[PDB]
């Protein structure tokens, strides 16, 4: 009954690696001793309940702290000047100077300035006082309590769901699309139309009077009569001021498009109409699959009979239903890939089409949110590929996938890997070559020789969307175009002015720097996909190790025989692709941050001139914008950014410490620990105190994991202070 | 308020120290006979 009760081998392990491996295999429930599928699924269900409880506790904590210690009520009156407060600081290490510097935001105590946009979100959805935030926090706390009770309950004997119920795909998909997506989005549209539009128009609608107050003067009579245009009639005027009745309309569902002029955010009526329409579409979608009545579809039948003629895709999608519904790793990988794509989409769309009031002028929050969601998108994509590899090495059955669409991937994996290698090499060679050419040309005082390629195709797409400065005059940019004529009466009158207005991040102007950095991003994405795809496809075996599936997913090596077999397990292909994930998201965030900093400063010529060469990138972005951060504290004093400076150097330290684990490997440290063991055992007094687990150096995979974690954490903790502190100090 | 002073040390020094002590003792518990 040692600590790794789930692993008898680790329990009998006498060294200190028992603790490490137990901790890191605690959640690998599939490989646990004496584990069954039904128990696995039930334990997963309970852990999901606990996780949801944690999420709602985190949200309730944010709300409570803003309500109690934040200046939400003061910020509501003057959103564009008052700095939002996250929470108070309690630190007995602070000096008087630190307390004075951190006293800010119109409060009498030290505080932290929120950079998450929660103030903007809550103000937009219609929170006006600390009481509303407190009651929301209480509701979320009660929800977390209920979820924890549910997680406890569903592990009970009489309340333990069965494996057939878990594997009921059709009912789950029907409900999680018609209710979880559809009805929830309908509920959000109802919340907007009942509470948010009235609050933006100067009406205090709360639980005590939402029953009495009508969302529309007409009521539901237009809805039941079919005269649904009455709800679009009388939209908000361009002279409207958010939160006040002056210039306010009566429409609840509109398609104006563009942006609200005062807040430079999308119309709440447009957002409500969006959610209503998409809820209708989701509710219709959720009746597809057969559940207990007769109508519907069978996913097994669909997949089985989807096979093209003459065996183009082999046997088609036969057996994919079985593999997907049997293997949880494939489902996890698909979910992670979809969620990573969605996270990239929200990151790309929040800045281009801001939805929350006054967020466009809050430059720190925009950069923080973009960097945050892009990093999480990268993490989710790497996880999706890693779990695909785990599925291949653990849950793939060639007998079931005899000549399947999935098996043909393994059939021509060599071609796939070689072509990924080719495209990666081409992009890298030519992007780096053009960059170095531009560097040398500017270095020799002759910038005229630069190879500057205009992103003609992206500019063409901008023109097709409605941009006019390029002069392409295609589709929506052409006044005569049939597309413009068709859309002229619904959304184009707002969209055209929004896109052509130069004060906005919607379809930013692009140039040779954008061309070059986009091709660098393509290089990085293709190389990350190369590493991950090769890991997934060679996880089962390789010419250097055809029996890799017997060893499994994460093993150290096969020894120095056959020339050396370092980093062969396809867990090491996660490890090696995490570096490229950090690289590509770093390039993306550098690009976003610099192109937005220059535009906020009204100095886009600096980006357009200096972004074409790496010296310009190093000088005008990092070196230039690093001054307010490093000057957070100096010999003469300290500012509110001293915390950010400390963290920049702390992330630097963690990143550098990761290199130790990544470079120096286990034998050196094992011999050193043997010497230390000798010294401890031979010294007097101290030899009375004796360990229980024999100290040993960290395992190979353990130290790869630790070094990668140090690398990643130093990466994020040294870039976040930069992107926040420089943006705060410049305020542009 | 005084809740920060009362709670921050309680939850960041006393509780994590007790948690580390409990975890260490539990992992060092031997098999039952």
């Amino acid at each position: 009954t040692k600590f790794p009760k789930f692993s008898q081998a680790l329990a009998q392990d006498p060294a200190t690696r028992r603790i490490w491996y137990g901790i890191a295999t605690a959640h690998d429930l599939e490989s646990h001793d004496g584990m069954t599928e039904e128990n696995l699924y039930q334990k997963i269900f309970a852990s999901h309940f606990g996780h949801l409880a944690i999420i709602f506790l985190w949200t309730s904590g944010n709300l409570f702290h803003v309500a109690w210690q934040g200046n939400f009520q003061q910020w509501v009156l003057n959103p564009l000047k008052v700095k939002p407060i996250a929470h108070a600081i309690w630190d007995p290490h602070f000096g008087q100077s630190a307390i004075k510097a951190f006293t800010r935001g119109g409060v009498s105590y030290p505080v932290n300035i929120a950079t998450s946009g929660v103030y903007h979100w809550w103000y937009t959805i219609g929170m006006r006082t600390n009481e509303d935030l407190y009651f929301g926090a209480l509701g979320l706390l009660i929800l977390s309590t209920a979820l924890l009770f549910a997680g406890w309950l569903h592990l009970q004997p009489k309340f333990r769901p069965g494996i057939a119920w878990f594997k009921n795909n059709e009912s789950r998909l029907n409900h999680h699309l018609s209710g979880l997506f559809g009805v929830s989005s309908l509920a959000w549209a109802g919340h907007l139309i009942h509470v948010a539009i009235p609050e933006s128009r100067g009406q205090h609608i709360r639980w005590n009077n939402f029953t009495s107050t009508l969302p529309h003067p007409e009521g539901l009579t237009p809805f039941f009569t079919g005269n649904w245009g009455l709800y679009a009639e009388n939209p908000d005027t361009a002279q409207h001021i958010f939160g006040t009745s002056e210039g306010a309309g009566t429409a609840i569902l509109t398609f104006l498009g563009g942006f609200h002029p005062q807040t430079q955010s999308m119309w709440l009526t447009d957002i409500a109409h969006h959610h209503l329409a998409i809820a209708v579409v989701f509710i219709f979608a959720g009746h597809m699959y057969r559940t207990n009545w007769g109508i519907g579809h069978s996913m097994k039948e669909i997949l089985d009979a989807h096979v093209p003629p003459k065996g183009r895709l082999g046997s088609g999608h036969r057996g994919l239903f079985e593999t997907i519904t049997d293997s949880l790793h494939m489902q996890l990988g698909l979910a992670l890939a979809s969620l990573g794509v969605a996270t990239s989409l929200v990151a790309q769309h929040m800045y281009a089409l801001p939805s929350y009031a006054f967020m466009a002028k809050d430059y720190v929050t925009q950069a923080a949110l973009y960097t945050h969601h892009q990093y999480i998108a990268g993490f989710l994509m790497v996880g999706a590929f890693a779990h695909g590899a785990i599925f291949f090495v653990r849950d793939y059955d060639p007998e079931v996938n005899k000549d399947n669409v999935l098996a043909r991937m393994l059939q021509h994996k060599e071609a796939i890997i070689s072509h990924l290698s080719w495209v990666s090499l081409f992009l890298g060679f030519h992007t780096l070559g053009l960059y170095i050419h531009n560097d040398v040309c500017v270095a020799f005082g002759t910038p005229e020789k630069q190879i500057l390629f205009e992103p003609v195709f992206a500019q063409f797409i901008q023109a097709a969307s409605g941009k006019a400065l390029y002069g392409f005059d295609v589709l929506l940019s052409s006044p005569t175009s049939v597309a413009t004529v068709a859309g002229s009466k619904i959304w184009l009158p707002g969209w055209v002015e929004a896109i052509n207005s130069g004060k906005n991040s919607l379809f930013l102007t692009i140039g040779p720097g954008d061309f070059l950095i986009h091709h660098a991003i393509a290089l990085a994405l293709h190389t990350t996909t190369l590493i991950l795809v090769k890991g997934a496809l060679d996880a089962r075996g390789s010419k250097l190790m055809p029996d890799k599936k017997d060893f499994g997913y994460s093993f150290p090596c096969d020894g120095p025989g056959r020339g050396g077999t370092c980093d062969i397990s396809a867990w090491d292909a996660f490890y090696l692709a995490m570096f490229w994930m950090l690289n590509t998201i770093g390039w993306v965030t550098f690009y976003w941050h610099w192109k937005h900093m220059t535009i906020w400063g009204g100095n886009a010529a600096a980006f357009n001139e200096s972004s074409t060469y790496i010296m310009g990138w190093l000088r005008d972005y990092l070196w230039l914008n690093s001054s307010p951060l490093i000057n957070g504290y100096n010999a003469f004093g300290m500012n509110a950014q001293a915390v950010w400076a400390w963290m920049f150097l702390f992330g630097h330290l963690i990143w550098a410490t990761g290199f130790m684990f990544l470079i120096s490997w286990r034998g050196y440290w094992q011999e050193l620990i043997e010497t230390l063991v000798w010294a401890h055992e031979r010294t007097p007094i101290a030899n009375l105190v004796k360990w229980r687990d024999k100290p040993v150096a960290l395992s190979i995979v353990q130290a790869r994991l630790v070094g990668l974690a140090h690398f990643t954490i130093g990466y994020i903790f040294t870039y976040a202070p930069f992107v926040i502190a420089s943006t705060t100090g410049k305020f542009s | 308020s005084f809740l920060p002073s009362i709670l921050t040390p309680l939850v960041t020094l006393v509780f994590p120290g007790l948690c580390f002590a409990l975890f260490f003792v539990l992992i060092e518990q031997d098999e039952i006979a």
């Binding site: 334990k43 309970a46 852990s47 309940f49 606990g50 409880a53 506790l57 409570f64 309500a67 109690w68 600390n130 009481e131 407190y134 926090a137 209480l138 706390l141 009660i142 977390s144 309590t145 924890l148 009770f149 997680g151 406890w152 592990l155 009970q156 | 308020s1 809740l3």
Partner: peptide, 30 residues
């Protein structure tokens, strides 16, 4: 302005959540 009583009832609900979390953790361990 959030009141001391409001903070206290929220803390009580948090303690209830703590007890339920401990129970859920025990049931997950077994």
């Amino acid at each position: 302005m959030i009141t001391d009583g409001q903070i206290f009832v929220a803390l009580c609900i948090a303690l209830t959540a703590a007890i339920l979390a401990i129970g859920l953790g025990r049931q997950l361990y077994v």
